Amino acid sequence: LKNAXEDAXAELXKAGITSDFYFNAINKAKTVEEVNALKNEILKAHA
């Protein structure tokens, strides 16, 4: 059910990101909207 953590996790694993700020933002993100926003932004930026 709550896969939006491991999705945003594995995707940023695949994208090759290891930046502490975005990791903190992603894991601190309590709402999935933030997760989608952060992930889609940085993923598109590192696609």
Q: Per-domain residue ranges for the chain?
A: 4-45
Identity of the amino acid at 39: K
Which residues are within 8 A (CB) of 41 and not within 5 positions of it... i.e. 6 or more apart? none
Neighbours of 11 (CB within 10 A): 15
CA gap 47, 29 in Å, rounded:
22
User: CA neighbours within 13 Å on the CB side: how many for 33?
Assistant: 1
> In CATH, what is the architecture of 4-45?
Orthogonal Bundle (1.10)
Q: Long-range contacts of range 28-34, CB-CB < 8 Å, 24 or more positions apart? A: 32/4
Q: Long-range contacts of range 19-25, CB-CB < 8 Å, 24 or more positions apart? A: none
Paired tokens of 40: 């889609």
| Closest to 39 (Cα-Cα) out of 26, 28, 21 | 26
Experiment type: NMR
Place of tokens 């995707």: 11
Breaks (C-N over 2.5 A) in the chain follow: none
CA gap 13, 30 in Å, rounded:
20
